[PDB]
């Protein structure tokens, strides 16, 4: 608010207008970044009053109406991450609206599977949705229906460890905390640069004007103007570079929303390690948290194997699965779970004769 300084700052022309135009483009982008992650759902889906999800226990991740109506895990996430013409502007979506979007994404996912991303949400029972997500990783769906209580207990137990982990480390949430720390350190640096001289008599602008004649004060003020304008250009350039990094991370979060939450990704290690079954969004300060659920194979055995088997001079290959032996008998199994089937003409298909294939083995094929 120095009028002597204000008249000198006009000599620099468009610089002060284009700094505000730059920061306005950064500010508008933060609302677009947030919209493209969370606003992927057309309708605000809500979860049924009774939770008949086949033994899978969504309760830590669904809304708690006693609380913003965040989930239990979203309350851990929001607890763990923690005036010189400078102003902070509110986001367009409030933290309660972001939680109403993660609530709708989650309720659609649980009650309708992948279908709410491709059209209208079509209901399906949760154990039948998981049976399809097992087929999606190449494990036959009877493996789920025969192990359903074990699979539900392993899921419920694995969600329990997320509460423990989030109650007992900062190492994971360090990504969101660093985005808070970088923006706070940038504004502190910008404010501390008001105390610098830049070779002027004083850093205090009234203390220049009250102790020098007009032409001398003008020359000292122009050093403060030059250094403070360079201090803003440095801050705005650094915020432009940091906004491009946040936009790359928001485009990745928007892609994991579509491909991991609204779908079942076939892409290796895109939706966590192991063969991806599904994932759930939780909102966090300045970010999103994905709880990626994956099938991990766990207790292998060695077997002898052969590429084909030789029957009536015909070479047989499995339609799906692999031929294996326990040392005395030959079976075909699905590839990702040991389930030996007796080898038959409908487990298999013929191609040519036994003379061609390297490592074929002689066997009976039962014809039903």
């Amino acid at each position: 608010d120095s009028t002597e300084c204000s008249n000198l700052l006009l000599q620099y022309g468009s610089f002060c207008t284009q700094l505000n135009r730059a920061l306005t483009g950064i500010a508008v982008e933060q609302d677009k970044n947030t919209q493209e992650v969370f606003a992927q759902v057309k309708q605000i889906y809500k979860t049924p009053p009774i939770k008949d999800f086949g033994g899978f226990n969504f309760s830590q991740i669904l809304p708690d109406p006693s609380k913003s109506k965040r989930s239990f895990i979203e309350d851990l996430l929001f607890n763990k991450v923690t005036f010189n013409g400078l102003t902070v502007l509110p986001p367009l979506l409030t933290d309660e609206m972001i939680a109403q979007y993660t609530s709708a994404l989650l309720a659609g996912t649980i009650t309708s599977g992948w279908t709410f991303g491709a059209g209208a949400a079509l209901q399906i029972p949760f154990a039948m949705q998981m049976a399809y997500r097992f087929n999606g990783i190449g494990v036959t769906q009877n493996v789920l229906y025969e192990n359903q209580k074990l699979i539900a207990n392993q899921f419920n137990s694995a969600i329990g460890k997320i509460q423990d982990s989030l109650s007992s480390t900062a190492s994971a949430l360090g990504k969101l905390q660093d985005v808070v720390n970088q923006n706070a350190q940038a504004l502190n640096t910008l404010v501390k640069q008001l105390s610098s001289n830049f070779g002027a008599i004083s850093s205090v602008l009234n203390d220049i004007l009250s102790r020098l004649d007009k032409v001398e004060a003008e020359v000292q003020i122009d050093r403060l103007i030059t250094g403070r304008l360079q201090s803003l250009q440095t801050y705005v350039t650094q915020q432009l570079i940091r906004a491009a990094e946040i936009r790359a991370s928001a485009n990745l979060a928007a892609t994991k929303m579509s491909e991991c939450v609204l779908g079942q990704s076939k892409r290796v290690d895109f939706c966590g390690k192991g063969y991806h079954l599904m994932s759930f969004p939780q909102s966090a300060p300045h970010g999103v948290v994905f709880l990626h659920v994956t099938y991990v194979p766990a207790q292998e055995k060695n077997f002898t194997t052969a590429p084909a088997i030789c029957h009536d001079g015909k070479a047989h290959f499995p339609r799906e699965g692999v031929f294996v032996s326990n040392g005395t008998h030959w079976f075909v199994t699905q590839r990702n779970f040991y389930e030996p089937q007796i080898i038959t003409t409908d487990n298999t298909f013929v191609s040519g004769n036994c003379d061609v294939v390297i490592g074929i083995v002689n066997n009976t094929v039962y014809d039903p």
Partner: protein, 413 residues
């Protein structure tokens, strides 16, 4: 239109200006006016010096109202050299020397920088580069007596003229002859001390006048003498311009719980900005809040459709500025609506605005979409009996206009 350099404006929210509350008045505070310099003797004393034996006070570690030296009609003349008489109350000095004597009314014009005359030559000499002031007044009521006051004297001759502030009270015999006097009168050897003999009935040029000369210096040793400090009343809760003990600022002053230690005077924020002050008289601690400010945004449908607008004062309380408070700021000229719609123009903090039904700008909480309970149960499935082929359009940027600048033609040319 002037922000956009255009006569046609598209639908949107545009920052056109900044709002800033102005200081309602100025405030100044300093400690209780105290420790007056010893001038209470200098201008009231019964005794006074003979001019050949002038008496010096040394003034330090104090303040005084130097304007009284000419605002009071008690003094018949006041003069200043280097300094200006109206400026004295703003100044500070390491020492001041207050030199005092009696002279007859005809001698008064000799008391100036670098002069010559019976006083300047033989009684009291001022330097050519003197900085300070002179008080002079008729003292026929103080220094004259019936039959003559012979207690006042001057030196009529000296062997050499006085150097600046030389103070020769010695009974030296003056020599004008070729023979040395050896401490006694003789051939052109004279005792040079002479009495005024001041009488109440003297003519004004022969009446006594008192003089005080205030002599100023600022040294390598810091200032110890200053003029007085003003202090206004104190105003809370309004935005004001302010000064406490020479710490200047502008903002809103408010009562605070912060217990400063007994020697502490200022409070500072994490980024070294001053956030509180002790009042230097009634020793309360005041928080300082910035004087309220923020962007001003104009919310408009396109000028193809209306010339009505709303205005948002970003982060401002509507008390400071239809009128409607939002968490984004004070919103003016928009009707608050209890319905919710898709967001048209984004205001912030869940609020949006549009032009709608006589039509006006409306402001509403944004709708995220229609609410839907999916008809879930452990044995119900929905299967689509028909389809639609959809054609979506996606637009992606791929290149910019290729530019070249000859920087020597741009900078110089």
């Amino acid at each position: 239109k002037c922000t956009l350099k255009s006569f046609t404006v598209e639908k949107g929210i545009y920052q056109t200006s900044n709002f800033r509350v102005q200081p309602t008045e100025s405030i100044v505070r300093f400690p209780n006016i105290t420790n007056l310099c010893p001038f209470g003797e200098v201008f009231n004393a019964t005794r006074f010096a003979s001019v050949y034996a002038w008496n010096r006070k040394r003034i330090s570690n104090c303040v005084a109202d130097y304007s009284v030296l000419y605002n009071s009609a008690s003094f018949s003349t006041f003069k200043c050299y280097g300094v200006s008489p109206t400026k004295l109350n703003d100044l500070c000095f390491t020492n001041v020397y207050a030199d005092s004597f009696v002279i007859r009314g005809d001698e008064v014009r000799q008391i100036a920088p670098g002069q010559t005359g019976k006083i300047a030559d033989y009684n009291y000499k001022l330097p050519d580069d003197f900085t300070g002031c002179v008080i002079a007044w008729n003292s026929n009521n103080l220094d004259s007596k019936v039959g003559g006051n012979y207690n006042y004297l001057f030196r009529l001759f000296r062997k050499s003229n006085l150097k600046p502030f030389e103070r020769d009270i010695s009974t030296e015999i003056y020599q004008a002859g070729s023979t040395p006097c050896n401490g006694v009168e003789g051939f052109n050897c004279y005792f040079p001390l002479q009495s005024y003999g001041f009488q109440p009935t003297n003519g004004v040029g022969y009446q006594p006048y008192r003089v005080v000369v205030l002599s100023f210096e600022l040294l390598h040793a810091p200032a110890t003498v200053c003029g007085p400090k003003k202090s206004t009343n104190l105003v809370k809760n309004k935005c004001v311009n302010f000064n406490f003990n020479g710490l200047t600022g502008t903002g809103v002053l408010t009562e605070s719980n912060k217990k400063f230690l007994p020697f502490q005077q200022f409070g500072r924020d994490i980024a070294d900005t001053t956030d509180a002050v002790r009042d230097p008289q009634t020793l309360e601690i005041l928080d300082i809040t910035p004087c309220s400010f923020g962007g001003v945004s104009v919310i408009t449908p396109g000028t193809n459709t209306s010339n009505q607008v709303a205005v948002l004062y970003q982060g401002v309380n509507c008390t400071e500025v239809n009128v409607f408070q939002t968490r984004a700021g004070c919103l003016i000229g928009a009707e608050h609506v209890n319905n919710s719609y898709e967001c048209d123009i984004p205001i912030g903090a869940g609020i949006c605005a549009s032009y709608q039904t006589s039509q006006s700008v409306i402001a509403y909480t944004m709708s995220l979409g229609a609410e839907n309970s999916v008809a879930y149960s452990n044995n119900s499935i929905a299967i689509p009996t028909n389809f639609t082929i959809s054609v979506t359009t996606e637009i992606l940027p791929v290149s910019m206009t290729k530019t070249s600048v000859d920087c020597t033609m741009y900078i110089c040319g």
